[PDB]
Structure 1
Amino acid sequence: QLTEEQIAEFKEAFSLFDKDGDGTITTKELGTVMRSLGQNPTEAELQDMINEVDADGNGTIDFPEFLTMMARKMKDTDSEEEIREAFRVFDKDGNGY
């Protein structure tokens, strides 16, 4: 079961994902966010990701789609891999914390 705090956090994440409020994360905004973070995904890779995340070929991702994607279960190994990757990305400096 979900919670009100989780719903509010998901809504805030959806709002912050796109620079302009239109109900869609948008490929251009996602690419700009990726470049700001320090990543340069290929156009073909981004198109493949958009197609896979979306349930059809409409080419637009919505807030319910993001909520469903965030609801996936990673089990155990994927969870530790994800947290390790997040820590490595956050630990850019050579300090160990």
Structure 2
Amino acid sequence: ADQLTEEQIAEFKEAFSLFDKDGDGTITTKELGTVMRSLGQNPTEAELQDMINEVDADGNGTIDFPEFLTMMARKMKDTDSEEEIREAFRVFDKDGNGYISAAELRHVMTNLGEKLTDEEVDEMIREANIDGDGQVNYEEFVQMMTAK
């Protein structure tokens, strides 16, 4: 669960820094809207308040960088997902740098849970361009998951 893409997250942290009271990096619901505006968006104190009213139970009342991503992803509705997927595979890439196990891979399909039931993912994993024992070019699986 790395939320948006590392890049968008990089520029986000920057904003999260421009606004940092605890000196650590977190911010207060009050500066929230101010941070969202700095990122490059233009939310409304209304919806912005709708999210705060929720995270207003952390105990301290302040929001941390991660929690801020969550509320930030709800407005942007994540990306093309191609990111959460690519990483889903790296979670196993043991130096292979280009291939992952087919078994574990099947597990990745369980985490995402798109629209390819085991039967669909099976017919695929069955011939995902394999050749060795059970390796799979996750890279090809990342795009081949969308195809036409």
Q: TM-score range by the shorter chain?
A: 0.3 to 0.5
Range moving further from structure 2, 78-87 or 65-74: 78-87
- Runs (5+) with no aligned partner, structure 2: 100-148
Q: Is the 8 A contact 2:16 2:27 kept in 1?
A: yes
How much has 1:14 moved relative to structure 2?
A: 0.6
- Deviations along 1:18-62, one digit per CA (max 9) or x if unpaired, are 256323213675699899999999999999874423354431211
How much has 1:84 moved relative to structure 2?
A: 34
How much has 1:13 moved relative to structure 2?
A: 1.2
Q: How far apart, in 2, do the equivalents of 1:3 and 1:90 lie?
A: 19
How much has 1:5 moved relative to structure 2?
A: 1.4
For normalisation by structure 2, the TM-score amounts to 0.31
Instruction: Indicate the structure (1 or 2) with the bigger Cα radius of gyration.
Output: 2
**Alignment correspondent of 2:75:** 73
For normalisation by structure 1, the TM-score amounts to 0.43
Q: How far apart, in 2, do the equivalents of 1:36 and 1:94 lie?
A: 39
- Aligned partner (choices 15, 18, 22) of residue 16 of structure 1: 18
Distance 1:65 1:91, change over 3 A: same
Q: How far apart, in 2, do the equivalents of 1:3 and 1:41 lie?
A: 21
Q: How far apart, in 1, do the equivalents of 2:9 and 2:40 lie?
A: 28
- Runs (5+) with no aligned partner, structure 1: none
Q: Count how many residue pairs are aligned between Structure 1 and Structure 2.
A: 97
